């Protein structure tokens, strides 16, 4: 699953080849700056350790040496700038080409990349993947070569000056390189590892949030919160172990640096004392070979990121190569010009590309001339829509062929074909565009004249006059701000402006009003003579005007002929017609007040590890002083031994203190985030649904808070004290020890350390992640891609993919340009600051030559002042960059504390209310009005009234959303109204309890939703916080014929169900949810869409679960088909807020109305 290296860089032109070769050479010369620097320093230390002894010409020697340092500094300035910029420009150009090209191929792909290859996963295989290639072939390969250079240069210097010590520093070099390698991997991408412990828990957190209303209604907070807590403690353990490992890694790196110092000096003093070497010879060889041996470990993540790069480029390239058999960028199909409209279907079969096992269609044969209109009648899902698709060559037959105007479409161009044809599907959708462009979608040259013409044609001119911004109003997403009438009218007008020739409609009058349906149909009919038409409708009003009427059985057209044809047959359509006629906050330390022993030991170890650097400065300056002074061999030997031993002990203390600081601050951080997520969640399940509706308060925002808050607050409590105290020990001691050893040089060199400190921070970001990678700009380009991606098959027949392809490019142009400039900007700052380090050895040491020449200090005094402020500012930067940001984290903690302290209007945990002793089961509604807090302008119900009694099985039926979802949340208290009055047995639910109400009665939702638990769990979940009996389950589970399918499946009551209902179908689940509240044994029965997805022979055993238990309960059944409603006691049909009817059934039948039709769909 990897693509070769030669076939990796294929989207690079001549300019990109010059950007890669020069960046590589520039990086090969910038990596030889450190080793060469150690060649000059070890040479300047032999000067400073031979003068003053015999101050003559000492100043002159230092000026010549200063030139060398400024030369290396300038070389590194130029080479760094080139390397970083050129490599970031070669990867910035290629990746852009690949984005455009990948997206160009994704659009022009044969239908069948949504059933076979999931689509969201395609967004993760696009955006993310593209970013992974970018990080792969980008700047990293620069970094690699540089480090490689520092290897070879290193050892070459090591072997040229003196080799007896290079073989020794090399004998241990595997371990040095291995520690460096391990540390390099833990340094890079150390912020992209926080979703491993919150991955398994993320699911449980998302699942409870997905159905908050069901948990509140059924009581089941407790067990959900408990599952959560368990997930938590697991993630906590993993986090602690990772913190321990990170700090052990850095500790071992420092232990090995220091023990290698110890060995180098213990042996190099034997060499020096035997006259063989000098001290410059030892400092050069040792420093250079050590730098080489670590900079070969710095080069491990480059190979790791390259392997990832090609491992993803494989799959991308295999998409881009995939040329579909049927497409529109082949341009080979003939373009016909004599169009008359000749639909010819002869033996057309089909098996779903999604599922080949079932052929829902078994052969058809029909012929339709121009102007000939045919209606099509059948059940919803008889292959009507899919056949209207297959008309436009959205698919191809499995046996046979479809032809038009004599010849078949299997050889001619499709673009002209899929253009000249208009098709309004079952549900036409519209995107985030303008109504001018909404209509203009068909083709290009559609003028405002044509726009106004179409809005006249489809009666779509009214909302122009009544709603302002008459031609530039931004319709909602998927057509939201509009209504069904506006949607359907702009749909028919748009389908008219494309200059159609064959017009195919699917359920053309689902939601259209009385006048609206008629005007839609007539506007369509005035265009039925110069253009063929085939219609599908369920209202038989939009069928009569067809020339022929067809009958769908197994997707086949078996009944054919005009009206009188089937009206003498007395068939199916006959039966149809005969039945019809804020503020910041600083108290966050009072969140983590309880874990103080941890912070005490943490501050202590921070102090020790921050003071270890001046200790090294002193020891190093003194161990060179050992060789400048005039002593004997024996005193030099003993002081060299003691100082080597102090180096070793410093290394060991460094290791221990690092592991300890890591342990303790990591454990305090994990305890904090654990407790914090627990409390956030707990306080989350107390807010009403009138808090949980808002789409500015979405599940995705909540999941980000749960994890993100954890991260942020853990940062802005523990890491802040870690960092401040390390840095204070470090630079406080460095500056204060320097000021008293020479103030002249410290005053100068303390006007540099801002830039050395800043230089360390910018480098650190460059070393691990921190490549800016702005995605907010990318999100806008991505959002356009997501739209087309959601309905690629539906849009392709519109042919608008061009006008979306370009909607990609013209958008990607903003950030690309910007990103280009940035790969220059960063390339200088980095470079500049690196240069500054190489310049310090020229300034300080030059000034040093002055002072040592006027006996205002000593050599080892300059070494101690320099080593303790320059290296100190380096350490200050590298430390202050290895910790989370502050202001971000402070804002996160601000919001978390904002929500923690919350107090809901109505508490679900609070016991308040009415806890009566008796009840009969009566409900009454009066002048009750109900409104959202987010949607006040659109009303649903308009102050209705009801009267429901005990055992009385209420009957209610409506269309798709006239207010039947309304009444549910009014009885199980998700909603609060501002008007009306409700009397449950004369006892208002606005006074009565809200949890005591819930242990008393139990309802069923539209659909069953379920757990990652056992089947026994969800069915027993229906009642909690009380001793549940295994037999009560086998009571209702058998009572509903649902245990029958439980005892057969292995682990009958012990099979861990799939997620949310993937391991079974609906008919299996529609039992267990009614059976869920069956075990509740309430005093009020409520169902809603209980025959939604269930077998007509199981709707008996599921409705019999009612009848023998209807007793005592205020039974309110609501279904779609009247099969179960006709046995319900009292029928209350609704229409848009006003109570359409209420009373005995024959009150609804002798006076015939909208119900007289609602039972007239398919009666027998």
């Amino acid at each position: 699953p990897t693509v070769s290296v030669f076939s990796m860089f294929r989207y690079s032109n001549w300019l990109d080849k010059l950007y890669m070769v020069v960046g590589t050479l520039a990086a090969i010369i910038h990596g030889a700056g450190l080793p060469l620097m150690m060649l000059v320093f070890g040479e300047m230390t032999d000067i400073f350790a031979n003068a003053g002894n015999l101050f003559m010409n000492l100043e002159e020697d230092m000026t010549r040496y200063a030139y060398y340092y400024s030369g290396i500094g300038a070389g590194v300035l130029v080479a760094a700038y080139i390397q970083v910029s050129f490599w970031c420009l070669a990867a910035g150009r290629q990746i852009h080409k690949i984005r455009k090209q990948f997206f160009h191929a994704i659009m022009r792909q044969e239908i069948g990349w949504f059933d076979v290859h999931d689509v969201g996963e395609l967004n993760t295989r696009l955006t993310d993947d593209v970013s992974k290639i970018n990080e792969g072939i980008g700047d990293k390969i620069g970094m690699f070569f540089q480090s490689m250079a520092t290897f070879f240069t290193g050892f070459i210097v090591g072997f040229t000056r003196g080799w007896k010590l290079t073989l020794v520093i090399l004998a241990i070099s595997p371990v040095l390189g291995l520690s460096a390698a391990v540390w390099a991997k833990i340094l890079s991408s150390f912020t992209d590892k926080e979703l491993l412990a919150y991955a398994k828990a993320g699911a449980v957190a998302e699942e409870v949030l997905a159905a908050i209303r069901t948990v509140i209604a059924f009581g089941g907070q407790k067990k959900e919160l408990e599952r959560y807590n368990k997930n938590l403690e697991e993630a906590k353990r993993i986090g602690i172990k990772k913190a321990i490992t990170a700090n052990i890694s850095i500790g071992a790196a420092f232990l090995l640096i220091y023990a290698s110092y110890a060995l180098a000096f213990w042996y190099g003093t034997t060499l020096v004392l035997s006259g063989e070497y000098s001290i410059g010879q030892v400092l050069t060889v040792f420093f250079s070979v050590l730098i080489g041996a670590f900079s070969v470990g710095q080069a491990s993540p480059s190979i790791e990121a390259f392997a990832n790069a090609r491992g993803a480029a494989y799959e991308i390239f295999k998409i881009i190569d995939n040329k579909p058999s049927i497409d529109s960028y082949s341009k080979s199909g003939h373009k016909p010009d004599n169009i008359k409209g000749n639909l010819e279907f002869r033996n057309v079969h089909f098996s779903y590309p999604s599922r080949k096992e079932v052929k829902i269609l078994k052969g058809l044969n029909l012929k339709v001339q121009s102007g000939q209109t045919v209606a099509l009648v059948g059940n919803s899902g008889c292959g009507k829509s899919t056949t209207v698709q297959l008309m436009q060559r959205l698919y191809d037959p499995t046996e046979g062929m479809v032809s038009v105007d004599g010849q078949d479409i299997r050889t001619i161009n499709v673009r002209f074909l899929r253009e000249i044809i208009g098709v309004v599907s079952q549900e036409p959708v519209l995107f985030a565009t303008t109504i001018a462009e909404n209509i203009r979608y068909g083709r290009e040259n559609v003028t405002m004249d044509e726009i106004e013409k179409a809005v006249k044609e489809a009666n779509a001119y009214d909302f122009i006059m009544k709603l302002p911004h008459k031609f530039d109003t931004l319709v909602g997403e998927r057509g939201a701000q509009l209504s069904g009438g506006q949607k359907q009218r702009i749909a028919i007008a748009r389908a008219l402006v494309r200059n159609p020739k064959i017009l195919l409609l699917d359920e053309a009058t689902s939601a259209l009003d009385t006048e609206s349906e008629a005007v839609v149909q007539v506007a369509l009919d005035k265009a039925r003579k110069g253009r063929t038409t085939i219609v599908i409708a369920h209202r038989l009003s939009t069928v009569r005007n067809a020339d022929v009427i067809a009958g769908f059985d197994d997707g086949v057209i078996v009944e054919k002929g005009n009206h009188d044809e089937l009206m003498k047959e007395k068939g199916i359509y006959f039966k149809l017609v005969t039945m019809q006629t804020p503020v910041s906050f600083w108290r966050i330390m009072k969140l983590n007040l309880t874990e103080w022993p941890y912070f005490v030991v943490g501050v202590f170890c921070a102090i020790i590890n921050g003071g270890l650097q001046p200790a090294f400065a002193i020891i190093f300056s003194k161990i060179i002083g050992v060789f400048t002074r005039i002593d004997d061999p024996e005193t030099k030997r003993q002081n060299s031994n003691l100082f080597s031993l102090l180096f070793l002990a410093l290394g060991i203390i460094s290791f221990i203190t690092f592991f300890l600081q890591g342990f303790t601050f990591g454990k305090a951080g994990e305890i904090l985030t654990k407790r914090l997520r627990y409390m956030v969640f707990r306080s989350m399940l107390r807010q009403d649904v009138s808090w949980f509706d808002d789409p500015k308060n979405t599940t995705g925002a909540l999941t980000t808070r749960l994890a993100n808050d954890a991260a942020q607050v853990k940062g802005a409590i523990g890491s802040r004290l870690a960092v401040i105290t390390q840095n204070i020990a470090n630079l406080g001691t460095g500056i204060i020890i320097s000021f008293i050893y020479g103030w002249q040089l410290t005053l100068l060199l303390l006007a540099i350390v801002p830039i050395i400190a800043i230089a360390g921070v910018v480098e650190m970001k460059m070393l691990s992640g921190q490549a800016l990678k702005d995605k907010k700009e990318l999100e806008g380009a991505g959002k356009i891609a997501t739209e087309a991606i959601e309905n690629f098959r539906t849009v392709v027949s519109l042919t608008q993919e061009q006008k979306f392809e370009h909607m990609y490019a013209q958008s990607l142009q903003v950030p690309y340009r910007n990103s280009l400039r940035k790969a220059h900007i960063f390339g200088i700052t980095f470079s500049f600051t690196q240069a500054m380090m190489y310049f310090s050895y020229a300034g300080c040491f030059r000034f040093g030559a002055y002072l040592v020449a006027h006996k205002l200090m000593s050599f080892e005094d300059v070494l101690l002042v320099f080593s303790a402020v320059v290296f100190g500012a380096m350490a200050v930067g590298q430390v202050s960059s290895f910790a989370p940001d502050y202001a971000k984290a402070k804002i996160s903690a601000a919001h978390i504390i904002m929500i923690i302290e919350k107090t809901p209007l109505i508490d679900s945990y609070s016991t308040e209310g009415l806890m009566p002793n008796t009840l009969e089961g009566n409900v009454t509604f009066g002048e009750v009005v109900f409104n959202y807090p987010t949607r006040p302008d659109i009303p649903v119900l308009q102050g209705l009234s009801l009267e429901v009694k005990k055992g009385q099985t209420l009957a209610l039926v409506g269309s798709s959303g006239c207010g039947k979802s309304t009444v549910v949340q009014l009885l199980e208290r998700f909603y609060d109204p501002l008007a009306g009055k409700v009397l449950l047995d004369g006892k208002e639910i606005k006074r009565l309890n809200v949890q005591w109400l819930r242990a008393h009665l139990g309802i069923v939702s539209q659909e069953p939703i379920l757990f990652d638990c056992s089947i026994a769990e969800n069915i027993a979940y229906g009642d909690n916080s009380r001793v549940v009996s295994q037999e009560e389950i086998v009571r209702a589970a058998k009572e509903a014929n649902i245990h029958a399918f439980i005892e057969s499946l292995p682990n009958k009551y012990s099979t861990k169900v799939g997620d949310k209902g993937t391991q079974l179908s609906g008919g299996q689940k529609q039992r267990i949810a009614i059976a869920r509240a069956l075990v509740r044994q309430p005093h009020i029965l409520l169902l809603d869409e209980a025959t939604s997805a269930l077998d007509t022979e199981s709707e008996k055993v599921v409705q019999e679960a009612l009848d023998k238990a209807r007793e005592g309960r205020t039974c309110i059944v609501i279904a779609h088909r009247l099969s179960t409603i006709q046995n319900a006691d009292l029928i209350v049909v609704f229409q848009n807020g006003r109570v359409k009817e209420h009373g005995t059934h024959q009150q609804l039948l002798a006076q015939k109305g909208i119900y007289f039709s609602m039972v007239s769909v398919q009666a027998g």
Partner: antibody
Framework: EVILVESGGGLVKPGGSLKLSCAAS????????MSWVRQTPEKRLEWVAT????????YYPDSVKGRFTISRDNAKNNLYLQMSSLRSEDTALYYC????????????WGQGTLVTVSA | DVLMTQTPVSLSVSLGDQASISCRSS???????????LEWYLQKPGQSPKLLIY???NRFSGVPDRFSGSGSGTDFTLKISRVEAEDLGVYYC?????????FGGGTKLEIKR
């Protein structure tokens, strides 16, 4: 040049206590190992003590250890030898001595300070 | 310890002649580093001794070219050519290889008159 001048010697009663000093001018006194050497009245030299260039290390032979104590003061450029419980065999002339880079042990001496020890 | 002897005692050298002064150690003088320290010191009547040649074969800055010193192991010798009256005193062969540093007896140089 390098001018060392010592002082502090005279007649002492056995078991007594005395303190010789050696003041040095003309170089960077805070950088050189310094030794004390002694010449007995048979005219046969003998090493007596050494001190490194910062005061840390110090070396005595195996017949003086415990009694003598040599120390230095870099601020005034002084080198002291405090002798306690003197014997009858410690009657001799006492030279300062500097140490020379390239590892020669007594580069630049001083003049004696005779220290007679008797009753 | 290590005791350094010096076999000649009374030298009767004449102006223009040569002189050979031995120093025959007892243990073998070789430091851990591998260097061999053995310096020669001169004392002219009534003065502090002055350093002559350090290590084994070297000359302090400010000495004549007639002074030679060669040898190996425990045997070391000093030679003086063309003896000039400015060269008359007692010669000590210091050695610093082992933790008690020990001078030598001393040789008297009596120029013939």
């Amino acid at each position: 040049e390098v001018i060392l001048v010592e002082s502090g010697g005279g007649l002492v009663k056995p078991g007594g206590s005395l303190k010789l000093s050696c003041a040095a001018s003309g170089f960077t006194f805070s950088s050189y190992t310094m030794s004390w050497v002694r010449q007995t009245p048979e005219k046969r030299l003998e090493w007596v003590a050494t001190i490194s260039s910062g005061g840390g290390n110090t070396y005595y032979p195996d017949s003086v250890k415990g009694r003598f104590t040599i120390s230095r003061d870099n601020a005034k450029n002084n080198l002291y030898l405090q002798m306690s419980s003197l014997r009858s065999e410690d009657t001799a002339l006492y030279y300062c001595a500097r140490y020379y880079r390239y590892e020669a042990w007594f580069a630049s001496w001083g003049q004696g300070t005779l220290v007679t020890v008797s009753a | 310890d290590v005791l350094m002897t010096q076999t000649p005692v009374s030298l009767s050298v004449s102006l223009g002649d040569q002189a050979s002064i031995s120093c025959r150690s007892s243990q073998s003088i070789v430091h851990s580093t591998g260097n061999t320290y053995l310096e020669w010191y001169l004392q002219k009547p009534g003065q502090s001794p002055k350093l002559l040649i350090y290590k084994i074969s070297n000359r302090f800055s400010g000495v004549p070219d007639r002074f030679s010193g060669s040898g190996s192991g425990t045997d070391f010798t000093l030679k003086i050519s063309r003896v000039e009256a400015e060269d008359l005193g007692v010669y000590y062969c210091f050695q610093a290889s082992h933790a008690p540093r020990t001078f030598g007896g001393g040789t008297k140089l009596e120029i013939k008159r």
